[PDB]
Amino acid sequence: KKWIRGGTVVTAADTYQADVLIEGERVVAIGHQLSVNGAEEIDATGCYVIPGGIDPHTHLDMPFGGTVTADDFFTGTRAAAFGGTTSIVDFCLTKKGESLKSAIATWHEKARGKAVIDYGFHLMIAEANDQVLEELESVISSEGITSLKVFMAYKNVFQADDETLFKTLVKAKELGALVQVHAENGDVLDYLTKKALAEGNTDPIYHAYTRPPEAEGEATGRAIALTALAGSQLYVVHVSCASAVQRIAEAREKGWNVYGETCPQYLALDVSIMDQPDFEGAKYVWSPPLREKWNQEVLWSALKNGILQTVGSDHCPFNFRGQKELGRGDFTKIPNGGPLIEDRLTILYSEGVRQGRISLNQFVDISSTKAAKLFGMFPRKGTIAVGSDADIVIFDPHVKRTLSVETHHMNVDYNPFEGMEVYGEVVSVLSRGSFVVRDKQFVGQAGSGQYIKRTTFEQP
């Protein structure tokens, strides 16, 4: 038994002052004057009390290049916890000619004992031959997985043809699974990529100009069209640019079940930061690339008027030295990815709520709740109500602080928002009503995290 009193609680809907009362793992009662017989106090006067961040886009301990992502399931989840997030959903990668159960098995072992907070998996689909379509039944029922990434880019590495894409959409309809897509046209990027090399433009900046917004717009559009044709449901990850928001809007006007996600870097960074003398642009090499500043407003507007509806990290980080160095000679060999898991929550807060782009209630919805409802964790996660796992987060909105590698908790040598002056700070984080962070101290234990078995798809 724990007792948070003094807090102003904030959810996707409600904003009120009251004490919450946790017993075991779950919130149990909310109000004035509860029955707190002999239970641990926690003072939350002055602070906001909010549900835990859910971060539906994480690639922890992944290979990309012959090298692996810096954070593991321990370093990763900890950093998430530090930066306000209590539950992640990671991308289980399948390898053509692939026991689907054996890939999953691998991702479980990658977590077990390391993870401090709760976590779930998405399942990547490489080919959708008869073999794989069969296995999908097992996984949705037994293995607690009900969402499915298809990459339309990374040619000869992860890329899938329209066939795979469509068969997977129609199955997903049949089984009740959200399909997700990395919507860029591999084929046009490969050509532009191999051409820019032909001409000796090897700098990291040419990572951005070799995958123009027109190519995201196109694949997003395409993936929407098949979803329409299949009668299925879509979640475009990482929308970076206006060309795609346009395509998502358009479909959601015709009432189809299309969904959208950004990340902070597209909300808070632009291309100009890559044009930088020495290898400094490799800090920003990730896909889709950073875009022109015009697009930040459009992305924001979309979140605000409910056109996009979740925010993830796409945390996939690599060290500037040694790792992002593989590829001094050419940008194709820069492993693509950023360290974004930690600051996410608070940049949403500081740049968004605090400068009047979204409401405080939307900030929760956009970082926590809506991601639970799409990925079938609701109401175990993503809210403060009676029954809900006690994934609470006390949050002090008055602190002003500068984001930095000197002070962050991810296991990497840089921070893409290095130097950003920012409001808000994570005081304490509970996961199923146990401290992971207290007064900004790691009091958690490795292995405490539990796998979340998600339910099948249901609108919002």
* 72: alpha, beta or left? (left if phi > 0; alpha if psi -120 to 50): beta
* Residue 257 in the binding site for a copy of itself (CB under 8 A): no
Q: Is 314 annotated as a binding residue?
A: yes
Residue 161 interacts with a copy of itself (CB under 8 A): yes or no? yes
Q: How far is the CB of 288 from Mn ion (least distance, A)?
A: 8
Binders in 149-188 for Mn ion, by CB under 5 A: 182
The alpha carbon of residue 159 and the mean position of all alpha carbons in its chain are separated, in whole angstroms, by 20
Any contact of residue 185 with a copy of itself (CB under 8 A)?
yes
53 near a copy of itself (CB under 8 A)? no
Interaction with a copy of itself in 92-151: which residues (CB under 8 A)?
none
Q: Which is nearer to Mn ion, 314 or 351 (CB)?
A: 314
Query: Could you say whether residue 344 binds Mn ion (CB under 5 A)?
Result: no
Only one of the segments 42-50, 90-98, 188-196, 352-360 lies at the binding site for a copy of itself (rule: CB under 8 A); that segment is: 188-196
Residues 204 and 332 sit within 8 Å (Cβ to Cβ):
no
How many CB atoms within 10 Å of residue 328? 14
Q: How many residues bind a copy of itself (CB under 8 A)?
A: 24
Q: Residue 325, SS3?
A: coil
DSSP class per residue in 367-405: IIIHHHHHTT-TTTSSS-STTSB--EEEEEEEEEEE--T
225 counts as binding a copy of itself under rule CB under 8 A: yes
The answer to whether the bond into 204 is cis (omega within 30° of 0) is no
Is 184 a binding residue for a copy of itself by CB under 8 A? The answer is: no
Q: Which of 135, 143, 184, 314 binds Mn ion (CB under 5 A)?
A: 314
Backbone angles phi, psi at 2, to 5 degrees: -130, 155
Q: What is the four-CA torsion angle of 329, 411, 57, 7, rounded to 10 degrees? A: -150
Asked whether position 40 contacts a copy of itself by CB under 8 A, the answer is: no
- Which residues does 290 contact at the CB level (< 8 Å), separation at least 6? 208, 240, 265, 266, 269, 270, 271, 273, 274, 284
Among Mn ion, a copy of itself, none, residue 182 binds (CB under 5-8 Å by kind) = Mn ion
Picking from 20, 8, 116, 80, the residue whose alpha carbon sits closest to that of residue 384 is 20
- Is 315 marked within a binding site? no
CB 367, min distance to Mn ion, A: 18
222 near a copy of itself, judged by CB under 8 A: yes
162 binds a copy of itself (CB under 8 A): yes
* Span from 9-17, 217-225, 272-280, 425-433 in contact with a copy of itself (CB under 8 A): 217-225
Q: Does 188 bind a copy of itself (CB under 8 A)?
A: yes
Residue 403 C-beta: closest distance to a copy of itself, Å: 36
Told to check if 214 binds a copy of itself by CB under 8 A, we report: yes
Kindly indicate which of the ranges 63-71, 134-142, 221-229, 362-370 contains the residues binding a copy of itself, using the contact rule CB under 8 A.
221-229
Task: For residue 228, state whether it binds a copy of itself (rule: CB under 8 A).
Answer: yes
Q: Which does 314 bind (CB under 5 to 8 A by kind): Mn ion, a copy of itself, none?
A: Mn ion
Q: How far is the CB of 172 from a copy of itself (least distance, A)?
A: 14
**Looking at beta carbons only, is 166 or 395 nearer to a copy of itself?**
166
Instruction: Identify residue 63 by its one-letter amino acid code.
Output: P
Burial class (CB in 10 A: 0-12, 13-18, 19+), 401: middle
126 beta partners: none
Q: Give the separation between CA 117 and CA 76, rounded to whole angstroms.
A: 10
* Distances 357 to 294, 350, 387 between C-alpha atoms, Å: 15, 10, 32
Please measure the distance between the N-terminal and C-terminal CA atoms of the chain and give it in whole angstroms: 32
Residue 401, binding choice from Mn ion, a copy of itself, none, Cβ under 5 to 8 Å by partner class: none
Beta strands in 171-330 (DSSP E): 178-182, 234-236, 258-262, 310-311
59 is in an annotated binding site: yes
Neighbouring-strand partners of residue 63: 68
Interacting residues toward Mn ion by CB under 5 A:
182, 314
Interacting residues toward a copy of itself by CB under 8 A:
161-163, 165-167, 170, 185-188, 190-191, 212, 214-215, 217-218, 221-222, 225-226, 228-229
